[PDB]
Amino acid sequence: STGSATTTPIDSLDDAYITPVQIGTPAQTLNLDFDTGSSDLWVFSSETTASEVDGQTIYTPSKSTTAKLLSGATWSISYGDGSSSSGDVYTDTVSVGGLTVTGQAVESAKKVSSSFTEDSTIDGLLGLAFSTLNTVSPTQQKTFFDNAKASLDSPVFTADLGYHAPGTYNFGFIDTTAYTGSITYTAVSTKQGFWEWTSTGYAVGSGTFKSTSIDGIADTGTTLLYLPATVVSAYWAQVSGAKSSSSVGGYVFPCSATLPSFTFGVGSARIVIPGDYIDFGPISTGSSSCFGGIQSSAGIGINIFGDVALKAAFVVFNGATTPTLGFASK
Please tell me whether residue 186 binds ligand U1Q under the rule CB under 6 A. no
| Residues 225/324, Cβ–Cβ less than 8 Å | no
- Footprint of ligand U1Q on 269-328 (CB under 6 A): none
Q: How far apart are CA 58 and CA 30, in angstroms?
A: 7
Q: Catalytic site residue 4?
A: no
Q: Catalytic site residue 35?
A: yes
| Residues 196/189, Cβ–Cβ less than 8 Å | yes
Q: Considering only 75-83, 163-171, 181-189, 272-280, which stretch makes contact with ligand U1Q by CB under 6 A? A: 75-83
Q: How far apart are CA 128 and CA 121, in angstroms?
A: 20
Please tell me whether residue 189 binds ligand U1Q under the rule CB under 6 A. no
- Among 168, 200, 210, smallest CA distance to 315 is for 168
Closest to ligand U1Q by CB, 83 vs 120, is 83
| Residues 3/19, Cβ–Cβ less than 8 Å | no
Q: What is the dihedral of CA 249, 76, 37, 8, to 10 degrees?
A: -80
Closest to ligand U1Q by CB, 143 vs 200, is 143
Closest to ligand U1Q by CB, 89 vs 328, is 89
Q: How far apart are CA 141 and CA 106, in angstroms?
A: 9
Size of the site for ligand U1Q (CB under 6 A): 10
Q: Considering only 48-56, 73-81, 151-159, 193-201, which stretch makes contact with ligand U1Q by CB under 6 A? A: 73-81
Distances 258 to 9, 147, 276 between C-alpha atoms, Å = 22, 45, 8
Q: Which residues pair with residue 213 across a beta bridge?
A: none
- Among 263, 204, 271, 272, smallest CA distance to 238 is for 204
Angle (CA) 195-196-199 rounded to 5° is: 125
**Binding residue for ligand U1Q, selected from 29, 66, 83, 154, defined by CB under 6 A:** 83
Name the catalytic one among 39, 85, 95, 199: 199
Q: Considering only 74-82, 175-183, 185-193, 248-256, which stretch makes contact with ligand U1Q by CB under 6 A? A: 74-82
Q: How far apart are CA 119 and CA 142, in angstroms?
A: 26
Q: How far apart are CA 52 and CA 114, in angstroms?
A: 7
Q: H/E element holding 197? A: strand 196-204
Q: How far apart are CA 121 and CA 36, in angstroms?
A: 19
Contact mark string toward ligand U1Q, 108..147, x via CB under 6 A = -----------------x----------------------
Closest to ligand U1Q by CB, 193 vs 205, is 193
Please tell me whether residue 222 binds ligand U1Q under the rule CB under 6 A. yes
**Binding residue for ligand U1Q, selected from 2, 13, 52, 80, defined by CB under 6 A:** 80
**Binding residue for ligand U1Q, selected from 25, 79, 173, 282, defined by CB under 6 A:** 79
Name the catalytic one among 33, 35, 119, 219: 35
Q: How far apart are CA 224 and CA 145, in angstroms?
A: 24
In this structure, is the dihedral angle defined by the CA atoms of residues 181, 14, 86 and 295, taken in order, positive or negative? positive
Least distance to ligand U1Q, CB of residue 95, Å:
22
Contact mark string toward ligand U1Q, 25..44, x via CB under 6 A = ----------x-xx------
Closest to ligand U1Q by CB, 13 vs 234, is 13
Please tell me whether residue 221 binds ligand U1Q under the rule CB under 6 A. yes
Please tell me whether residue 107 binds ligand U1Q under the rule CB under 6 A. no
Least distance to ligand U1Q, CB of residue 38, Å:
6
Give the residue numbers marked as catalytic: 35, 199
Binding stretches for ligand U1Q (CB under 6 A): 35, 37-38, 79-81, 83, 125, 221-222
